[PDB]
Amino acid sequence: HMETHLTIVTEALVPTPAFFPLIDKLAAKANTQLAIITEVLAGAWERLEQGRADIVIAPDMHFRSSSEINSRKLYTLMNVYVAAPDHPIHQEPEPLSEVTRVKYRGIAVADTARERPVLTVQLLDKQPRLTVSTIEDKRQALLAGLGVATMPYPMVEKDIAEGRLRVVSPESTSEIDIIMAWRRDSMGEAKSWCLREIPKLFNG
Amino acid sequence: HMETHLTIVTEALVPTPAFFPLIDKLAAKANTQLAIITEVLAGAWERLEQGRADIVIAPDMHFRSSSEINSRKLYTLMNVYVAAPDHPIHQEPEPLSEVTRVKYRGIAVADTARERPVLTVQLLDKQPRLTVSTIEDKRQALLAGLGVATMPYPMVEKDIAEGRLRVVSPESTSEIDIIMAWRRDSMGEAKSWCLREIPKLFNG
Amino acid sequence: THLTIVTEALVPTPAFFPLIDKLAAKANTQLAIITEVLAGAWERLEQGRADIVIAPDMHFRSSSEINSRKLYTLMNVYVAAPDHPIHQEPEPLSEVTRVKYRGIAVADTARERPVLTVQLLDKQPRLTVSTIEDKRQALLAGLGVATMPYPMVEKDIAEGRLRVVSPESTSEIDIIMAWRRDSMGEAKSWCLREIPKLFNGK
Amino acid sequence: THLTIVTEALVPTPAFFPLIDKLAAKANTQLAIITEVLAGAWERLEQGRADIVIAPDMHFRSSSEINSRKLYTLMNVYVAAPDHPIHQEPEPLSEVTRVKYRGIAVADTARERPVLTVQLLDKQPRLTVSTIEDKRQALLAGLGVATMPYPMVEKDIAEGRLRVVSPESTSEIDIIMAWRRDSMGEAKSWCLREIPKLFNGK
Numbered sequence: 151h152m153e154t155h156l157t158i159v160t161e162a163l164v165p166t167p168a169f170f171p172l173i174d175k176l177a178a179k180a181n182t183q184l185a186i187i188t189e190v191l192a193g194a195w196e197r198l199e200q201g202r203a204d205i206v207i208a209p210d211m212h213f214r215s216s217s218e219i220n221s222r223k224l225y226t227l228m229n230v231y232v233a234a235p236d237h238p239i240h241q242e243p244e245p246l247s248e249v250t251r252v253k254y255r256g257i258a259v260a261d262t263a264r265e266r267p268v269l270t271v272q273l274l275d276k277q278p279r280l281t282v283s284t285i286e287d288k289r290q291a292l293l294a295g296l297g298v299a300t301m302p303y304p305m306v307e308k309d310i311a312e313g314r315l316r317v318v319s320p321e322s323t324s325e326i327d328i329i330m331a332w333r334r335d336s337m338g339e340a341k342s343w344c345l346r347e348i349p350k351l352f353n354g
Numbered sequence: 355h356m357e358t359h360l361t362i363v364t365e366a367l368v369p370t371p372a373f374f375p376l377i378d379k380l381a382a383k384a385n386t387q388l389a390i391i392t393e394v395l396a397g398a399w400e401r402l403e404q405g406r407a408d409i410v411i412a413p414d415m416h417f418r419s420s421s422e423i424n425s426r427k428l429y430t431l432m433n434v435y436v437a438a439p440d441h442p443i444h445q446e447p448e449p450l451s452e453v454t455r456v457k458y459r460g461i462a463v464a465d466t467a468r469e470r471p472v473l474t475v476q477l478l479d480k481q482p483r484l485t486v487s488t489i490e491d492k493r494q495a496l497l498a499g500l501g502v503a504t505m506p507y508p509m510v511e512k513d514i515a516e517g518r519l520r521v522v523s524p525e526s527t528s529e530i531d532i533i534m535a536w537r538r539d540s541m542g543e544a545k546s547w548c549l550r551e552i553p554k555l556f557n558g
Numbered sequence: 559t560h561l562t563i564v565t566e567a568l569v570p571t572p573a574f575f576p577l578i579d580k581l582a583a584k585a586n587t588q589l590a591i592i593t594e595v596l597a598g599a600w601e602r603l604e605q606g607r608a609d610i611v612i613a614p615d616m617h618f619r620s621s622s623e624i625n626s627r628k629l630y631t632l633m634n635v636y637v638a639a640p641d642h643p644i645h646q647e648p649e650p651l652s653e654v655t656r657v658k659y660r661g662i663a664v665a666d667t668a669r670e671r672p673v674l675t676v677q678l679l680d681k682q683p684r685l686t687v688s689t690i691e692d693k694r695q696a697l698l699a700g701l702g703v704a705t706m707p708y709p710m711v712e713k714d715i716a717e718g719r720l721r722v723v724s725p726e727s728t729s730e731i732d733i734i735m736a737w738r739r740d741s742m743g744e745a746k747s748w749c750l751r752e753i754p755k756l757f758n759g760k
Numbered sequence: 761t762h763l764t765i766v767t768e769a770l771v772p773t774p775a776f777f778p779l780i781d782k783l784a785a786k787a788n789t790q791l792a793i794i795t796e797v798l799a800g801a802w803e804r805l806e807q808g809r810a811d812i813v814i815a816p817d818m819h820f821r822s823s824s825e826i827n828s829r830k831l832y833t834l835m836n837v838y839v840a841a842p843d844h845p846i847h848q849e850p851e852p853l854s855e856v857t858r859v860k861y862r863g864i865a866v867a868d869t870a871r872e873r874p875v876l877t878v879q880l881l882d883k884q885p886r887l888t889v890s891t892i893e894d895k896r897q898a899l900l901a902g903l904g905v906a907t908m909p910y911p912m913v914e915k916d917i918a919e920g921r922l923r924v925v926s927p928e929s930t931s932e933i934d935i936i937m938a939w940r941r942d943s944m945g946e947a948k949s950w951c952l953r954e955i956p957k958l959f960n961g962k
């Protein structure tokens with residue numbers, strides 16, 4: 151109904167290309183131009199709170215208890231603690247022991263900058279770390295043997311199969327619920343349509 | 355509510371400060387941060403069409419009756435053809451004659467800086483012209499004796515009283531309806547509230 | 559024909575008015591003195607939609623094809639209305655304090671989103687306006703705290719309508735004249751010579 | 761203890777990986793190689809939130825105090841999927857034509873002096889993404905026409921997944937290393953010496 155602009159935020163763990171089917175359909179449904187922006191952890195939620203994002207696709211988080219924010223579970227994602235095959239972490243009797251983990255470099259994706267608070271990986275103080283902005287940069291660092299870190303399984307599935315990466319220990323494997331969140335204090339055609347279409351991209 | 359952002363566009367003829375009462379009230383009604391942006395003629399409407407403005411306050415225009423756009427008349431504004439007291443245009447028998455107007459410099463508000471003629475005296479081809487972006491710059495140019503142009507009466511009322519400007523000829527005085535316009539394809543709390551409050555600013 | 563000078567919002571357009579009559583005699587050139595905000599001024603120069611830009615010294619243009627010359631220095635003062643509570647603050651410039659009070663921004667290239675001067679924190683209230691005058695009126699009405707060009711508020715501070723929040727935040731900015739070297743028309747060349755003369759000793 | 765290098769989106773972060781082990785031996789410094797887009801990279805430097813910036817050329821100072829050095833040249837190519845109708849176009853770069861086809865933009869963290877890597881026109885359909893990878897995937901999927909860094913699509917062009925729209929639009933950009941002189945830590949100094957060595961021959 152004349153040109154419109156909707157802004158979807160996909161957190162770093164969420165593949166942006168999964169939302170590409172929406173683009174053509176949104177151009178036919180309305181005259182709506184899509185913006186699918188990437189943010190990291192709390193940065194995704196912050197965008198929603200500050201009213202700078204129509205819909206957020208992100209891991210379930212403590213922010214969700216907000217009264218004017220609706221939310222719905224989309225799918226589950228698996229996180230695996232990986233390292234390059236030749237990394238010494240593999241020869242460790244107790245790779246997840248606090249005494250062992252400090253010996254080896256962790257790799258973190260920043261949310262705004264170097265931020266100690268993280269839940270995916272418990273980086274310890276005095277432990278070496280590398281910090282990057284993108285999930286791809288983190289992958290390349292891991293492929294190059296530069297540290298040990300958690301990754302979304304889809305992004306490293308081929309890597310593990312083809313022996314470029316190796317799961318450090320299955321004990322650390324975690325499941326994260328990926329949720330769709332939005333604010334009820336505003337509504338439009340395009341936003342409503344997306345809220346209905348996005349779940350269809352995944353389960354049903 | 356938590357933070358929200360609304361964008362009101364006020365066309366150059368419309369004093370932005372008239373919307374200042376909204377600011378404090380909008381901070382209490384919701385957590386909404388206001389942006390009152392100035393545009394010139396068609397630029398104001400273009401923002402509305404492109405979905406880059408929640409509400410537009412602008413002169414009534416050829417854009418109107420557009421199917422997705424609601425509108426409401428707010429008030430009438432008077433436009434006066436003025437020049438500095440010492441300007442030779444005052445000594446002219448026929449100041450508004452095509453033969454006369456070409457002799458003297460017109461002043462236009464634009465961004466494009468090429469095509470002025472829209473709704474009023476306008477600028478004749480081959481006529482000397484100065485182009486400025488703001489209504490204030492146009493006022494100063496007129497005060498400095500540099501040309502002849504239309505101005506919104508409120509902005510030059512004191513100038514005419516105190517003999518800094520002088521109405522060239524009353525024949526050219528025109529009335530413009532200032533309307534509030536928005537798009538129906540979207541709605542939220544703040545937007546709805548403003549659509550109700552803005553007319554109240556101009557009751558009297 | 560047609561010359562376009564772009565004066566950034568901080569730069570008073572009327573300072574260029576002396577050029578108008580002279581340019582009409584020197585050449586048959588019709589002048590446009592267009593106002594833009596921050597990056598919008600430079601963008602016009604890059605896109606070849608402005609012959610000369612008068613603007614604060616700033617990043618970009620890929621460091622290709624842009625000549626520049628310093629015209630004068632401008633002082634920027636952090637001001638607020640006399641009765642604004644920011645004045646009673648022990649630490650008015652502390653991040654903990656600044657968040658309490660509304661900032662006021664002039665939107666850049668004339669749009670809401672492009673606003674990255676500085677001084678605005680998350681969770682901080684803000685108002686965004688298009689013009690430096692609108693920002694002045696907002697400040698006069700007590701609606702926030704913001705930086706202003708000293709010349710535009712000098713009388714305001716004298717006559718007690720505004721008050722400098724803290725001198726520590728005062729900054730000096732070089733106002734430069736910039737153009738592209740890939741063209742040198744008659745009118746353009748003449749203006750490049752005349753414009754510095756408008757500001758001599760300043 | 762903590763050094764922050766900012767690499768603009770056009771710059772491959774992994775090119776700086778050799779530094780990591782050496783920096784751990786040289787000093788006890790934990791490295792952050794952060795990605796930003798266009799002006800967002802510079803803004804970090806101005807706000808003192810980045811020790812070193814690797815980014816497309818600016819060379820211009822509002823914030824002042826900035827030293828810079830050229831590292832290497834990068835080529836940008838206007839590409840689209842092989843089956844995109846832009847290829848059948850007589851005049852693919854004509855303003856009349858470009859509006860017909862969707863542009864793809866990487867969003868910026870700052871005052872958008874660079875907004876269009878090539879040029880995005882009003883009324884023109886657009887998709888906006890945050891990352892250069894997302895933009896690549898969009899292009900691979902046939903969803904628009906946009907500029908890309910040649911190294912990132914060299915294999916794509918070879919293996920017929922992408923195709924250069926027109927060579928006329930190809931542009932060369934200097935990638936520079938920039939920093940502020942008002943500080944000179946051990947690690948920062950060492951990196952400023954090592955980083956140029958990573959791009960000998962380039």
Ligand code: NA
Nearest residue numbers: 166188891894
């Ligand atoms: Na992304």
Ligand code: NA
Nearest residue numbers: 369370392692
């Ligand atoms: Na105004």
Ligand code: NA
Nearest residue numbers: 491570571593
């Ligand atoms: Na001006």
Ligand code: NA
Nearest residue numbers: 284287773795
């Ligand atoms: Na990167």
